[PDB]
Amino acid sequence: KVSEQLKCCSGILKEMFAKKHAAYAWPFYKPVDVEALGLHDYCDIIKHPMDMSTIKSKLEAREYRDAQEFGADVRLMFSNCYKYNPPDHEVVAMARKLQDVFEMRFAKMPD
Ligand SMILES: CCS(=O)(=O)Nc1cc(-c2cc(NC3CCNCC3)c(=O)n(C)c2)cc2c1ccn2C(C)(c1ccccn1)c1ccccn1
Protein backbone atom coordinates (compact mmCIF):
# COMPACT_ATOMS: atom_id res chain seq x y z
CA LYS A 1 0.00 0.00 0.00
CA VAL A 2 1.46 3.43 -1.13
CA SER A 3 1.25 6.73 0.86
CA GLU A 4 -1.72 9.10 0.34
CA GLN A 5 0.86 11.55 -1.13
CA LEU A 6 2.04 9.05 -3.80
CA LYS A 7 -1.65 8.50 -4.65
CA CYS A 8 -2.16 12.30 -5.15
CA CYS A 9 1.01 12.22 -7.38
CA SER A 10 -0.82 9.76 -9.72
CA GLY A 11 -3.75 12.26 -10.02
CA ILE A 12 -1.36 15.22 -10.59
CA LEU A 13 0.29 13.35 -13.43
CA LYS A 14 -3.03 12.41 -14.86
CA GLU A 15 -4.03 16.05 -14.88
CA MET A 16 -0.87 16.81 -16.76
CA PHE A 17 -1.94 14.31 -19.42
CA ALA A 18 -5.51 15.70 -19.53
CA LYS A 19 -6.86 17.42 -22.77
CA LYS A 20 -7.15 20.60 -20.82
CA HIS A 21 -3.44 21.09 -20.94
CA ALA A 22 -2.58 19.27 -24.10
CA ALA A 23 -1.76 22.32 -26.19
CA TYR A 24 1.43 22.86 -24.03
CA ALA A 25 1.87 19.35 -22.43
CA TRP A 26 2.18 17.21 -25.60
CA PRO A 27 5.98 17.71 -26.16
CA PHE A 28 6.56 16.27 -22.64
CA TYR A 29 4.30 13.10 -23.05
CA LYS A 30 7.26 10.85 -24.16
CA PRO A 31 11.09 10.92 -24.29
CA VAL A 32 12.58 13.67 -26.51
CA ASP A 33 12.83 11.85 -29.90
CA VAL A 34 16.54 12.80 -30.48
CA GLU A 35 16.80 10.85 -33.85
CA ALA A 36 13.65 12.33 -35.44
CA LEU A 37 14.40 15.93 -34.22
CA GLY A 38 18.11 15.49 -35.13
CA LEU A 39 19.50 16.39 -31.68
CA HIS A 40 23.03 14.87 -31.83
CA ASP A 41 24.23 16.81 -28.67
CA TYR A 42 21.11 16.12 -26.46
CA CYS A 43 22.48 13.07 -24.53
CA ASP A 44 25.80 15.02 -24.05
CA ILE A 45 24.18 18.18 -22.52
CA ILE A 46 21.27 16.31 -20.80
CA LYS A 47 22.79 13.48 -18.64
CA HIS A 48 19.32 12.40 -17.20
CA PRO A 49 16.53 12.69 -19.79
CA MET A 50 13.01 12.67 -18.31
CA ASP A 51 9.44 12.79 -19.66
CA MET A 52 5.91 12.24 -18.32
CA SER A 53 5.73 8.60 -19.64
CA THR A 54 8.99 7.60 -17.87
CA ILE A 55 7.62 9.22 -14.66
CA LYS A 56 4.27 7.32 -14.98
CA SER A 57 6.10 3.91 -15.31
CA LYS A 58 8.39 4.76 -12.33
CA LEU A 59 5.42 5.89 -10.20
CA GLU A 60 3.22 2.81 -10.96
CA ALA A 61 6.22 0.39 -10.55
CA ARG A 62 6.64 1.99 -7.04
CA GLU A 63 10.27 3.22 -7.78
CA TYR A 64 9.58 6.60 -5.93
CA ARG A 65 10.09 6.39 -2.08
CA ASP A 66 7.89 9.51 -1.63
CA ALA A 67 6.17 12.48 -3.35
CA GLN A 68 9.48 14.49 -3.18
CA GLU A 69 11.25 11.94 -5.46
CA PHE A 70 8.23 12.09 -7.83
CA GLY A 71 8.50 15.95 -7.85
CA ALA A 72 12.30 15.86 -8.41
CA ASP A 73 11.69 13.81 -11.64
CA VAL A 74 8.92 16.19 -12.86
CA ARG A 75 11.25 19.15 -12.20
CA LEU A 76 14.21 17.40 -13.91
CA MET A 77 12.01 17.09 -17.06
CA PHE A 78 11.44 20.91 -16.96
CA SER A 79 15.14 21.64 -15.98
CA ASN A 80 16.31 19.59 -19.00
CA CYS A 81 14.09 21.72 -21.33
CA TYR A 82 15.37 24.96 -19.70
CA LYS A 83 19.02 23.75 -19.87
CA TYR A 84 18.97 22.52 -23.52
CA ASN A 85 16.86 25.21 -25.28
CA PRO A 86 17.14 29.00 -25.63
CA PRO A 87 15.16 30.97 -23.00
CA ASP A 88 12.81 32.55 -25.62
CA HIS A 89 11.96 29.18 -27.36
CA GLU A 90 8.31 28.14 -27.59
CA VAL A 91 9.07 24.73 -26.06
CA VAL A 92 10.34 26.62 -22.95
CA ALA A 93 7.09 28.71 -22.90
CA MET A 94 5.16 25.35 -23.01
CA ALA A 95 7.35 23.81 -20.23
CA ARG A 96 6.62 26.88 -18.06
CA LYS A 97 2.80 26.54 -18.50
CA LEU A 98 2.88 22.80 -17.63
CA GLN A 99 5.17 23.57 -14.73
CA ASP A 100 2.74 26.05 -13.41
CA VAL A 101 0.09 23.39 -13.37
CA PHE A 102 2.34 20.99 -11.62
CA GLU A 103 3.66 23.41 -9.03
CA MET A 104 0.19 24.45 -8.09
CA ARG A 105 -1.01 20.91 -7.49
CA PHE A 106 2.10 19.69 -5.80
CA ALA A 107 1.98 22.51 -3.30
CA LYS A 108 -1.79 21.93 -2.50
CA MET A 109 -1.13 18.20 -1.84
CA PRO A 110 -2.27 17.39 1.76
CA ASP A 111 0.50 16.39 4.27
C1 LIG B 1 6.51 13.87 -27.21
C2 LIG B 1 8.04 13.88 -27.33
S1 LIG B 1 8.59 13.82 -29.08
O1 LIG B 1 7.98 12.70 -29.71
O2 LIG B 1 10.02 13.93 -29.07
N1 LIG B 1 7.85 15.10 -29.81
C3 LIG B 1 8.35 16.41 -29.89
C4 LIG B 1 9.21 16.90 -28.90
C5 LIG B 1 9.69 18.20 -28.97
C6 LIG B 1 10.62 18.74 -27.95
C7 LIG B 1 11.74 19.44 -28.37
C8 LIG B 1 12.66 19.93 -27.44
N2 LIG B 1 13.76 20.62 -27.92
C9 LIG B 1 13.96 20.96 -29.32
C10 LIG B 1 15.42 21.28 -29.61
C11 LIG B 1 15.59 21.68 -31.06
N3 LIG B 1 14.73 22.82 -31.39
C12 LIG B 1 13.32 22.43 -31.22
C13 LIG B 1 13.07 22.10 -29.77
C14 LIG B 1 12.48 19.73 -26.08
O3 LIG B 1 13.25 20.13 -25.21
N4 LIG B 1 11.35 19.00 -25.71
C15 LIG B 1 11.11 18.74 -24.29
C16 LIG B 1 10.43 18.53 -26.63
C17 LIG B 1 9.41 18.98 -30.09
C18 LIG B 1 8.58 18.49 -31.08
C19 LIG B 1 8.04 17.20 -31.00
C20 LIG B 1 7.27 17.00 -32.18
C21 LIG B 1 7.33 18.16 -32.89
N5 LIG B 1 8.14 19.07 -32.25
C22 LIG B 1 8.50 20.41 -32.74
C23 LIG B 1 10.01 20.50 -33.02
C24 LIG B 1 7.76 20.70 -34.05
C25 LIG B 1 8.08 20.03 -35.23
C26 LIG B 1 7.35 20.30 -36.38
C27 LIG B 1 6.35 21.24 -36.32
C28 LIG B 1 6.10 21.87 -35.11
N6 LIG B 1 6.78 21.60 -33.98
C29 LIG B 1 8.12 21.49 -31.73
C30 LIG B 1 8.86 22.64 -31.58
C31 LIG B 1 8.46 23.57 -30.65
C32 LIG B 1 7.36 23.31 -29.87
C33 LIG B 1 6.67 22.14 -30.06
N7 LIG B 1 7.04 21.23 -30.98
Swiss-Prot record:
Native source organism of the sequence: Homo sapiens
Organism taxonomic ancestry: Eukaryota, Metazoa, Chordata, Craniata, Vertebrata
Tissues of expression: Ubiquitously expressed.
N-terminal signal peptide: none
Domain of life: Eukaryota
Variant or mutagenesis effect after changing N85A: Abolishes binding to acetylated histones
Localization annotation: Nucleus; Chromosome
Post-translational modification: Phosphorylation by CK2 disrupt the intramolecular binding between the bromo domain 2 and the NPS region and promotes binding between the NPS and the BID regions, leading to activate the protein and promote binding to acetylated histones. In absence of phosphorylation, BRD4 does not localize to p53/TP53 target gene promoters, phosphorylation promoting recruitment to p53/TP53 target promoters.
Recorded consequence of changing Y42C: Found in a patient with a neurodevelopmental syndrome; uncertain significance
Protein name per UniProt: Bromodomain-containing protein 4
Pathology linked to this chain's protein: Cornelia de Lange syndrome 6: A form of Cornelia de Lange syndrome, a clinically heterogeneous developmental disorder associated with malformations affecting multiple systems. It is characterized by facial dysmorphisms, abnormal hands and feet, growth delay, cognitive retardation, hirsutism, gastroesophageal dysfunction and cardiac, ophthalmologic and genitourinary anomalies. CDLS6 inheritance is autosomal dominant. A chromosomal aberration involving BRD4 is found in a rare, aggressive, and lethal carcinoma arising in midline organs of young people. Translocation t(15;19)(q14;p13) with NUTM1 which produces a BRD4-NUTM1 fusion protein.
Gene name as annotated: BRD4
Record-annotated site: Acetylated histone binding: N85
Functional summary from the UniProt entry: Chromatin reader protein that recognizes and binds acetylated histones and plays a key role in transmission of epigenetic memory across cell divisions and transcription regulation. Remains associated with acetylated chromatin throughout the entire cell cycle and provides epigenetic memory for postmitotic G1 gene transcription by preserving acetylated chromatin status and maintaining high-order chromatin structure. During interphase, plays a key role in regulating the transcription of signal-inducible genes by associating with the P-TEFb complex and recruiting it to promoters.
Location of the Bromo domain: 1-109
Transmembrane segments: none
Subunit-level organization: Interacts with p53/TP53; the interaction is direct. Interacts (via CTD region) with CDK9 and CCNT1, acting as an associated component of P-TEFb complex. Interacts with RELA (when acetylated at 'Lys-310'). Interacts (via NET domain) with NSD3, CHD4, BICRA and ATAD5. The interaction with BICRA bridges BRD4 to the GBAF complex. Interacts (via NET domain) with JMJD6 (via JmjC and N-terminal domains); the interaction is stronger in presence of ssRNA and recruits JMJD6 on distal enhancers. Interacts with NSD3. Interacts with NIPBL. (Microbial infection) Interacts with bovine papillomavirus type 1 regulatory protein E2. This interactions may serve for the tethering of viral genomes to host mitotic chromosomes allowing successful partitioning of the viral genome during cell division.
Note: JQ1, a thieno-triazolo-1,4-diazepine derivative, and I-BET, a benzodiazepine derivative, have been tested on tumors with success. Treatment with GSK1210151A (I-BET151, a I-BET derivative) has strong effets on mixed lineage leukemia and promotes myeloid differentiation and leukemia stem-cell depletion.
Family: Belongs to the BET family.
Domain characteristics, as noted in the entry: The NET domain mediates interaction with a number of chromatin proteins involved in transcription regulation (NSD3, JMJD6, CHD4, GLTSCR1 and ATAD5). The C-terminal (CTD) region mediates interaction and recruitment of CDK9 and CCNT1 subunits of the P-TEFb complex. It is also required for maintenance of higher-order chromatin structure.
